[PDB]
Amino acid sequence: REDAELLVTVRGGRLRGIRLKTPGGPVSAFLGIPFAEPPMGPRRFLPPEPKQPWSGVVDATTFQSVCYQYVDTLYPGFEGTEMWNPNRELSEDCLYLNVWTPYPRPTSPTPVLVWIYGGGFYSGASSLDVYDGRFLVQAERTVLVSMNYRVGAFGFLALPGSREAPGNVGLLDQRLALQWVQENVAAFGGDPTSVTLFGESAGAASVGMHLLSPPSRGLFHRAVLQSGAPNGPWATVGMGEARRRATQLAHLVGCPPGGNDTELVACLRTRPAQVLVNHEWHVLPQESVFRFSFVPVVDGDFLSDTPEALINAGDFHGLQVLVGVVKDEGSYFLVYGAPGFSKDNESLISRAEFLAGVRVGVPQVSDLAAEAVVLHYTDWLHPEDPARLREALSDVVGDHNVVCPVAQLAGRLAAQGARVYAYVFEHRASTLSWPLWMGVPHGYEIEFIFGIPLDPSRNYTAEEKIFAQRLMRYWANFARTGDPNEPQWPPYTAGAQQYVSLDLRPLEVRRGLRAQACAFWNRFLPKLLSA
Amino acid sequence: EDAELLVTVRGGRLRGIRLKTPGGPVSAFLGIPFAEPPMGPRRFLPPEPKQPWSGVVDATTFQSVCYQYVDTLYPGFEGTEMWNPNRELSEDCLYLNVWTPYPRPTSPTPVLVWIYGGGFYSGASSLDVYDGRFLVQAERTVLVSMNYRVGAFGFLALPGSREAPGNVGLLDQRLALQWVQENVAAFGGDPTSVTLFGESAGAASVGMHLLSPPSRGLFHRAVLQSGAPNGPWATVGMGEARRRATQLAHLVGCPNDTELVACLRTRPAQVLVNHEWHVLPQESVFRFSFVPVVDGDFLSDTPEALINAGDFHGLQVLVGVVKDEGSYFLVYGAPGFSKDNESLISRAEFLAGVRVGVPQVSDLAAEAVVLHYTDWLHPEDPARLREALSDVVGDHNVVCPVAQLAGRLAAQGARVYAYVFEHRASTLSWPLWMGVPHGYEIEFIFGIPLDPSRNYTAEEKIFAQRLMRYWANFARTGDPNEPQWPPYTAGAQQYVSLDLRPLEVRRGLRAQACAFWNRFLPKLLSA
Ligand SMILES: *[C@@H]1O[C@H](CO[C@@H]2O[C@@H](C)[C@@H](O)[C@@H](O)[C@@H]2O)[C@@H](O[C@@H]2O[C@H](CO)[C@@H](O)[C@H](O)[C@H]2NC(C)=O)[C@H](O)[C@H]1NC(C)=O
Ligand SMILES: *[C@@H]1O[C@H](CO[C@@H]2O[C@@H](C)[C@@H](O)[C@@H](O)[C@@H]2O)[C@@H](O[C@@H]2O[C@H](CO)[C@@H](O)[C@H](O)[C@H]2NC(C)=O)[C@H](O)[C@H]1NC(C)=O
Known part of the structure; x- marks a missing residue:
């Protein structure tokens, strides 16, 4: 009649899950659990309302809809881009969560990992195959x-001060x-009492904002x-x-026919x-990438305050964090x-294309700031070598947008009481479809963290499956103990700045x-932007 | 008397002296007056040509050193005393010296003209290290x-005045x-074959003659x-x-530019001098x-503006630096x-040294210097900070001005040869942490190691003979070669x-x- 392991009662009511086959054994999955009232109609742009209790049993047996978002069409049918695209229908009725648990249910309390997907706050979904828990x-x-x-305008369009579109409601859904x-x-x-957030790209930025927001x-208790x-x-x-962006979006779709924020x-x-979405x-004010x-x-x-300010002025004793980047963040x-x-x-660009790319990769800075960038990332013994220029522009975008914010976050947390571990992910997957010059691109450590190479229908190497199991162990050891070890992984500190x-x-x-x-x-550069 | 040592110039007759070298004799004519003494009412004025004289001017010994500060930092120390005046100081100092082979050449011989350095405040043609x-x-x-003329005597300027026009030391040259x-x-x-060469302020002087049409x-050539x-x-x-001229007047009790x-x-x-x-407006080194x-x-215009706008086709220049210009x-x-x-400074001293080594720049400019010369994996290492500050001062004041001059001239038609002098003399009295300090290539260019009364090694004498050949090759042909020394270009940027x-x-x-x-940094300062 019913499998007791797949039946759970939470505050809102009763749920029914599924038994998942994995290479190593069964897992219980509860997919598509409603945690908020659907933010439709009058509740678009509003903070999430908690899900009201229900009678009967809710079938939490498949992933729910993807929150409405732009769908990438740059390389149609290309695996490197389609793997990030929605694998469920788009809907504003999208505030559902998923729980994976061992089969049978654990008898003693078990550490919890909570994933927050990335996608530039304009896209993403917990249902993508590479996030299979x-x-x-x-x-x-x-x-x-x-x-x-919620992502895009539905999650982050803000008319600040207004009650009808206060902003950050996608963070409130989290x-x-x-x-x-x-x-x-x-x-x-x-x-x-043992919950570890982990996220990637905008998901990692989200995790950091939860660290910096007292509620x-x-x-x-720990963060990745x-x-x-x-x-x-x-x-x-x-x-x-x-x-300004909210007002321009309104103007572009015919609203109003600025003004009263309510009417707007x-x-x-x-x-x-x-x-x-269209x-x-x-x-966006200018021709950019990574904006x-x-x-x-x-x-x-x-x-x-700004994340920068909250970071520099924060007391982070009692906190363990694990941070890292891939080897080629910018490509x-x-x-x-x-x-x-x-x-x-091969994208072997010219000097002129490199100088033009600096303004696209570092938008909205004075000409002087752009000149500082070019001074720094030019090899003045080989100022116009196309291969060096391509690699330098990749470093500009990666350093400015990912690596150096990560490094500043790690250094300040470590100096102010936190226990920090840092990594650089340097394995290029045998299955990667992107060209060779891109190296280890952004986002392609995730599949190893989630153990995707163990999927039988994949054709990863046996070495990569060992690697994936090593990384899953590091991540779970951190979740359990705040320490990925058990060759050792030394903590990151502002002085030694050690990473693995x-x-x-x-x-x-x-x-x-x-x-x-x-x-x-x-x-x-902050000192330059102040004068 | 020896006829080789008697010469008639336009002003009158001279008597020289025969000197010994390990390779044979040479004729020298020391202390030839080329200007009227810039004394009394003539101080701060452009030089006037020496009036003709009757009789025979005695040109057998160096004449007086122009009035200048005498360094007293390390009294009796050879590293500083070798640059101090070795003749009595006088405002009557506008004399020059000529060395020629003995017997005097009968065919036109290429000419080298040496302009000494000393920050435009010191120096003399009579120093042992400049022995020709x-x-x-x-x-x-x-x-x-x-x-x-050096110091205020050579370069005090009330611009626009006819009593203190400025640059008269350059006009002496x-x-x-x-x-x-x-x-x-x-x-x-x-x-018709004159090669100018000079070091430090002498090199700056050489460049200013390159940039001044008169x-x-x-x-014809420059080093x-x-x-x-x-x-x-x-x-x-x-x-x-x-402002500096007016401040000097106030400091000495003076006093209208005429009255000043x-x-x-x-x-x-x-x-x-005192x-x-x-x-000077601020505490500083190298100002x-x-x-x-x-x-x-x-x-x-400014030397930079004249360098960027100049046609330098037909010019050959030889430029270079020592390995540790700043130490x-x-x-x-x-x-x-x-x-x-060992001068193992702290980070705080490094940051303080940056303000004195790069004076009169905004805090933002100083921060840019600190960013560029800090190893952010070893931000506090004493030995690394000592080198970094030495690099800051050497790059700002010598190496990068030299590199800019080389690149612009080469890109605009002249043939440049560039060098870095990397041998530390066995006789050097400065501590080893200073490396090859500023000015210690001169003794090798002048062949001083060949003096038997000095302690240079046999290899160093061969080395000195190599450098004399390069410098003389350049003076004769505009090319030091005769392992080839390639010209410096803005792209390849080659030096030896x-x-x-x-x-x-x-x-x-x-x-x-x-x-x-x-x-x-120029763009930074313009904002
Ligand atoms: C390398 O490719 C880029 C981008 O090109 C597009 O993709 C190429 C693989 C090829 O299919 C092109 O026909 C595509 O247009 C080239 O940059 C483009 O160049 C075209 C033609 O000059 C221009 O109209 C586009 O605006 C350019 N787009 C971008 C993003 O720069 C580049 O010229 C190629 N370089 C080579 C051939 O080495
Ligand atoms: C290295 O020496 C400097 C200068 O000190 C002088 O020279 C020494 C060789 C010795 O003769 C001292 O008596 C001299 O005073 C040191 O810098 C000075 O340090 C003193 C305090 O000891 C301070 O009062 C001065 O203001 C400093 N002056 C300068 C130029 O910085 C320096 O600390 C010494 N470093 C070492 C010991 O490695």
Whole structure:
């Protein structure tokens, strides 16, 4: 009649899950659990309302809809881009979460990993195949949770000060999911006193913002930030710029026929979701890569100050964090607008294309700041060698957007009481479809963290499956103990700046997360932008 | 009497002296007056040609050194005393010296003209390290050296005034160059093959003659050693020159530019010298009070502006630096440094040294320097900070001005040869942490190691003979070769290392560091 392992009661009511086959054994999965009221119609742009209790049994047996988002069409049918595209229908009815737990249910409380996907705050879904939590749960006997959150205008369009579109509601969907975990994860065997957030890119920036927001900080105990930080130049926006982009989006879709914020949002709520998605990229002030229209707003509520300020002034005793980057963070973003770049050739750019790419990769800085960038990333013994120029532009975008914000986040946390571990992911997957010059691109450590190479229908090498199991062990040991060890992985500190390389070879300790370059981005360039 | 030692120039008759070298004799004519003594009412005025004389001027010994500060940092120490005046000081100092082979050449012989350095505040043609006897015997050239007014006597300027016009020390040099054109053939020299060479402020002087049309017709080739006219220390603007001259007057009790200069001319020369260093606007190393002024006359624009707009086709220049240009200047004001300790400074002292080594720049510019010269994996290492500050000072003041001058000239038609002098003399008295300090290639260029009464090794004498051949090859043909030394170009940026080993070709005169000083920092300062 019924399998008791697949029946769980939470606060809202009863749920029914599925038994998942994994290479290593069965796993219980509860996919598509509603945690908020559907943010439809009058509740578009509003903070999430908690899901009201239900009678009967909710079938949590498949992934729910993807939150409405732009769908990438740059390389149609290409695996390297389609793997990030929605694998479910688009809907504003999208605030559901997923729980994976061992089969049978754990008898004693079990550490919990909570995943927050990335995608520039304009895309992403917990349902993508590369976020499949079944392998982590089977291999390491943790409970894994992932949630959807609203993206694009639906999650982050802000008319600051207004009550109809206050902004950051996509972050509040994440927080509501975290509150759901605290109240309900024990029913699945999870330990609410041992919750570790991990996320990638905008997911990592989200994790950092929960660290810096007191109402979120009490909902978890450790953090993992992969290829992202809340202090990234793309991750937040000012109140004035948020209002200008919101107002321009309205104007582009016929609203109003600025003004009263209530009349404005009300007009926006009458437009079909796809109409807003279609005009989203037009509100960006300039021709850029690695910039996104609707992102978290620094408005005094969710973030009482900028992530930079909160980081430098924070007390982080009692916190363990694991951070890292891939070896070639910038290359992926260059084929999305940088002159002379394509995945289908070598992208051997000229000096003129390099200088033009600097303004696209570092938008909105004075000519002087752009000149400092070029001075720094030019080899003045080979100022016009195309291969060096291509690699230098990739470093510019990667350093400025990922590596140096990550490094600043690691150094300040370590100096102010936190226990920090840092990595650089240096393995290029045998299955990677991107060209060779891109190296190890952004986002391609995730599949190894989630143990995807263990999927039988894949054709990863046996070496890569060992590698994946090593990384899952590191991540789960961190979740359990705040220490990935059990060759050792030394903590990161502001002085020694030690990190480990993650590849098929054993751990190798190195110093400096591009210390020379990040001194420019983190120490000097802010002083230049102040005068 | 020996006929070889009697020469008639346009002003009258001279009697020289025969000197010994290990390779044979040489004729020397020392202390030839080329200008009327710039005394009394003539102080601060451009030089006037020496009036003809009757009888025979005695040209057998060096004449007086122009009035200058005497360094007292390490009294009795050979490293500093070798640069101090070795004759009595006098304002009557406008004399020059000629060395020629013995017997005097009967065919026109290429001419080398030496302009000494000393920050435009010191120096003398009579110093032992500038002895021309070895070059003349070994390489069969005529060598000329002149004294020129330094300090306030040479470069005090009230711009626009006819009583203190400025740059008269440079005009002293030009007058000697005109004297060379009119009289050097009487010594066997060829006035159509004149090569200027100088070091530090002498090299800056050479560059300024390259950039001044009235001087350009008086020589044909140029050598600039560890100096350039575009250095941040080599010129001053009119406003700052007037302020420094006015501050000097107040410091000596004076007093209308006419009234100001008249009172200044009442003061003993040593009184002006005693207050010279105190007109500088800030504490600093590698800055000097009275330097050439850019007032539209001798220089119609800044040396950088003239270098960028110049057609230099038909010019050959030889330029270079020593391996550690900055180390010597640090013991004259940088906190934590001394020749008697390892000078292992702290980070705080490094940051303090940056403000004195790069004076008169905004805090933002100083931060840019600190960013570029910090190893952010070893930000506090004492030995690394000592080198970094030595690099800051050497790059800012010598290497990058030299590299900018080389690249611009080469890109605009002239043939450049560049070197880095990398041999530390066995006789060097400075501590080992200073490496190859500023100025210690000169003794090898002049062949001083060939002096038997000195302690140079057999290899160092061969090395000195190599360098004399390169320098003389350049003076004869505009090409030091005869392991080839390739020309310096803005793209390939090739230079050679000069030491006991054979020539080695390398690329880039600290290209990464000099891109910052040369390309970025000017834009920063303009904002
Ligand atoms: C390398 O490719 C880029 C991008 O090209 C597109 O992709 C190529 C693989 C090829 O299919 C092209 O025909 C495509 O247009 C080239 O940059 C483009 O160049 C074209 C023609 O000059 C121009 O119209 C586009 O605007 C350019 N796009 C971008 C993003 O720069 C580049 O010229 C190629 N370089 C080579 C051939 O080495
Ligand atoms: C190295 O020496 C300098 C200068 O000190 C002078 O020279 C020494 C060789 C010795 O003769 C001292 O008596 C001299 O005072 C040191 O810098 C000075 O340090 C003193 C304090 O000891 C301080 O009062 C001065 O202001 C400093 N002056 C400068 C130029 O910085 C330096 O600390 C010594 N470093 C070592 C010991 O390695």
